[PDB]
Design a protein around this ligand. Structure first.
Ligand SMILES: CN(C)c1ccc(C(=O)NN)cc1
Length: 330
């Protein structure tokens, strides 16, 4: 089997991407944030505290003939940005882009943090990291990908995120028309439950490439690119007037600037992030200070190749017995 679904930016900044997902019978379509940095499929639901729902589409398990309470199971998750959610669990039929899993754990939110309430366009998350990170207790549950894997033509999914445009998540096949050149594969560590890999270095603009190992995670659920302070300082030093602002919470730059590109290494290959991808616009409406798309990972504890990086590439998440990541230019 295979599946293919279009993923769409939620706003003009590509702050996140949503992908339609069919849950239950008859189908209830919710727009979920596919998240390769977590392993829970959770949704706004008829059980979510009313004051914490603001425009989202909800899953109502009582209207699904295939929903079953997973008796006694609860979940609770918190993300690196400080967001969180929690609730109980149903199993139901879930389909993505024509690919169907029966008996998928669908985690129904009773509570969500304000960040989720405020994101009217995001009806929940669909985790695509390793199932060892799943938060359901007392019986840990498998991700949609993990459940689908044995049925897939190939045990892979791909992320092809657009810059200010829709893109695609494919399951079970590699679309050889979706990228240029060749895909370079690199080793993954699953020890922390993430798609964790080691970049071989970086360059700023037309500058020389610096060979240096940068461990990090491929996280479609993080907006920005978070790298070591040394690397990030070297980037922003090439932008006149750029500075780190403790008041704003990161590097800002004059909105009159033209940003240089940023290159990261994948083995002997190189992925170039155009300067435009690094512009996250005015810090507040009407401001001439703009927020940068490359920020320090210091005080996160891990480097994060978020959407800013991933959208510059066609990315293969290879879930074979020994997982690997592949990157191609596009
Ligand atoms: C507030 N929202 C929509 C979030 C979405 C995703 C994440 C995240 O860290 N995913 N790996 C955090 C927050």
């Amino acid at each position: 089997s295979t599946g293919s679904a279009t993923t769409t930016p939620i706003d003009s900044l590509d702050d996140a991407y949503i992908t339609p997902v069919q849950i239950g019978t008859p189908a209830q379509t919710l727009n979920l944030d596919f998240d390769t940095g977590s392993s829970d499929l959770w949704v706004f639901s008829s059980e979510t505290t009313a004051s914490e729902v603001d425009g989202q589409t909800i899953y109502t398990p009582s209207k699904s003939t295939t929903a079953k309470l997973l008796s006694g199971a609860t979940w609770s998750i918190s993300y690196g940005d400080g967001s969180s959610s929690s609730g109980d669990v149903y199993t139901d039929t879930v389909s993505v882009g024509g690919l169907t899993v029966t008996g998928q754990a669908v985690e129904s939110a009773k509570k969500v943090s304000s960040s989720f309430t405020e994101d009217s366009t995001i009806d929940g998350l669909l985790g695509l990291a390793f199932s060892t990170l799943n938060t359901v207790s007392p019986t840990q549950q498998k991700t949609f990908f993990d459940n689908a894997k044995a049925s897939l033509d190939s045990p892979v999914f791909t992320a092809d995120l657009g810059y200010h445009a829709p893109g695609t998540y494919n399951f079970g096949f590699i679309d050889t028309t979706a990228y240029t050149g060749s895909i370079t594969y690199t080793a993954v560590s699953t020890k922390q439950g993430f798609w964790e890999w080691t970049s071989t270095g970086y360059a700023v603009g037309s500058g020389t490439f610096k060979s240096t190992s940068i461990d990090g995670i491929a996280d479609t659920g993080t907006t920005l690119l978070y790298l070591p302070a040394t690397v990030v300082s070297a980037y922003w030093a090439q932008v006149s007037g750029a500075k780190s602002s403790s008041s704003v919470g990161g590097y800002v730059f004059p909105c009159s600037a033209t940003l240089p590109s940023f290159t990261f290494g994948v083995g002997s290959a190189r992925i170039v992030i155009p300067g435009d991808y690094i512009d996250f616009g005015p810090i507040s409406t009407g401001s001439s200070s703009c927020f940068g798309g490359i920020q320090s990972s210091a005080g996160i504890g891990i480097n994060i190749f978020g959407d800013v990086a991933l959208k510059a590439a066609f990315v293969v998440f290879n879930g074979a017995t020994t997982p690997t990541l592949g990157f191609a230019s596009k």
